[model samples]
Target: GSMKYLNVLAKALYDNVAESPDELSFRKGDIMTVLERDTQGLDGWWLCSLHGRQGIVPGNRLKILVGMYDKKPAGEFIVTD
Candidate 1:
């Protein structure tokens, strides 16, 4: 059900501490796979896999890796009125 993020990698933008066992602790520049975003109805938090360990991390603390879109060209589309 969650295969879309199997290849999605994100780099940690800032250091974070895990307040609970379910959360992930990461340092700046650490790379991890983003499994799911906005998990458990929690805003700004995402499920990620790091070193085979799965846990939740602050979404804002991570930056999605870019420039490797196999299906199409890499670019952002925006619209305004």
Candidate 2:
């Protein structure tokens, strides 16, 4: 799980136009795949991928839904007669 890449799904909070080649451009409500939590030890900057392109996106601009699962845990299931 530590292969220098992650599959963290995040939603964009606001529209962001890439100011440089290293930044990713996306619209509000767009979903992005976060690659890394930080870029080169630089906080507030996250590596993300959108529309098959990879670039840096501000960490604060992303809305990560932590602990939001669609499926129930196996421990919650009970045997029925």
Candidate 3:
């Protein structure tokens, strides 16, 4: 099954602090909602991942990973209306 939407990649921090970033704290499996899309095809949304929580971000900002559910790799997600 495909993911419901696409997620733009972004840097995930261990905490909400500014300078207390983790060295090897990259995470995956975050789900983001496409809130807006530009004429250039760029989009914006919110991401919910284990690193911290969900938050609004640009759609063309993150490196998209394969979709997963129930702790298993499902497949890649696509954008469709």
- Per-model TM values vs. the true structure: 0.70, 0.69, 0.28
lDDT score for residue 39 of model 2: 79
- Per-residue error (Å), model 1, residue 12: 0.5
lDDT for 18 in candidate 3 is 23
| lDDT per residue (tens digit) for residues 33-81 in model 2 | 7778777577988888888788888878779854234433334445555
Local accuracy of candidate 1 as per-residue lDDT tens digits, 1-81: 222344677899899888887888889989987877888799988898886678999888788995345643323545434
In candidate 3, stretches whose alpha carbon ends up further than 4 angstroms from where it belongs are 1-43, 67-81
The 10-residue segment with the lowest total lDDT in model 3: 17-26
Q: What pairs collide in candidate 2?
A: none
When 2 and 3 are scored with TM-score, the better candidate is 2
Q: List the residue pairs that clash in candidate 1.
A: none
Cα lDDT computed for each candidate against the true fold: 0.78, 0.75, 0.37
What's the CA error at residue 24 for candidate 2, in Å? 0.1
lDDT of 1 at 72: 32
Instruction: Give the winner by lDDT.
Output: 1
- Could you give candidate 3's per-residue lDDT for residues 2-69 as a string of tens digits? 66334333343222322323211233333433322342333443333433533334334444444433
Candidate 2, superposed: residue stretches over 4 Å from native? 1-4, 66-81
Q: Worst lDDT window (10 residues) for model 1?
A: 72-81
Total clashes, candidate 2?
0
